[PDB]
């Protein structure tokens, strides 16, 4: 048991099937020799496979994960993309909250700030009460 997984930029990774197989999309692939993944760079891939090793089992979000995801925006998304792609039904969730956690209890100006999204808005800005 060991599957070889190849990142976008050449790099090849050995994971025990035990802790892969945690990606559904790869697991299903197995029933049904590197596997190429030309849509994750191996910085992510790395990170992914750590998440998997630590979760070879299975709001708030477990402390360890909390911690893991204490990463630059960029890298977040790149997980919350891979995760989806690999159907690591588990990691995506906790990633997704992390982000939402970010949006939570901010002001438009503020979220727009921290997410470096530009103010689209003309006019006024339709204000209704609840």
């Amino acid at each position: 048991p060991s599957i070889k997984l190849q990142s976008s930029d050449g790099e090849i990774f050995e994971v025990d099937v035990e802790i892969a197989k945690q990606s559904v999309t790869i697991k299903t692939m197995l029933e049904d020799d590197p596997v190429p993944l030309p849509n994750v760079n191996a910085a992510i891939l790395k990170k992914v496979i750590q998440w998997c090793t630590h979760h070879k089992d299975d709001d708030d979000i477990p402390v360890w994960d909390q911690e893991f995801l204490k990463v630059d925006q960029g890298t977040l998304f790149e997980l919350i993309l891979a995760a989806n792609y690999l159907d690591i039904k588990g990691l995506l969730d906790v990633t997704c909250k992390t982000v939402a956690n970010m949006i939570k209890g901010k002001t438009p100006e503020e979220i727009r700030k921290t997410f470096n999204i530009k103010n689209d808005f003309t006019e006024e800005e339709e204000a209704q009460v609840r």
Binding site: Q73, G74, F77, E78, I80, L81, N84, L92, C96, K97, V99, A100, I103, K104, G105, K106, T107, P108, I111, R112, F115, N116, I117, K118, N119, D120, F121, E125, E126, Q128, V129, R130
Partner: protein
Amino acid sequence: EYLAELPEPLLLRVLAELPATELVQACRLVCLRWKELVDGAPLWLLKCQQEGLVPHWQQFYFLSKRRRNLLRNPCGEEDLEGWSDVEHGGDGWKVEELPGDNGVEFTQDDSVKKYFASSFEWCRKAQVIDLQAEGYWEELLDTTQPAIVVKDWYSGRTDAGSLYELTVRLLSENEDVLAEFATGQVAVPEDGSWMEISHTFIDYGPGVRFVRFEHGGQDSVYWKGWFGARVTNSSVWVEP
């Protein structure tokens, strides 16, 4: 950054994760796409399925959220906690225990321990409901007119003939009778079974802000004590 370049479906998932309060309040103010998204059917539709709700969704969601009996103290567990215009014909109202002192026990719920009993004359109590103060805003009452639904249970004593009456109203702002349901007086069943009367209000029109609950009862025979009709478990709903 990367964010707003990430396929709609996931953006939902993230968004899915927030307090509707905040989706409506804040997110819809971040940027165009976001807003045009909060106003997605899919976005709510998910948050729904996300938490069971399924039997304009946003509303349905918020309703499904608010939905709960709006009548304070339906059974006399705090005597006449918060009933009012309470008129005490004869010996007044009185809270006794299930099952009736000669009169059958409840069925289609059994967290019901108690109920009010009426005298030899009319006994009426009432409640007024502030729909806004319960969290129902004007643009929804006047546009959506979701169904308001009134229920009340009542029964007799086996030993003596009784009489029930109900009268609910929907009201404009300045106490205007916008719709009525009245029953008139009704003969409470001889054998003291538990009868359950409902109304549902619909396409009622715009301006409702208040619901007035009022029912009452007494006996046909006219004896001191509490032989008049017995009510309980009264409830009022705004149904998504």
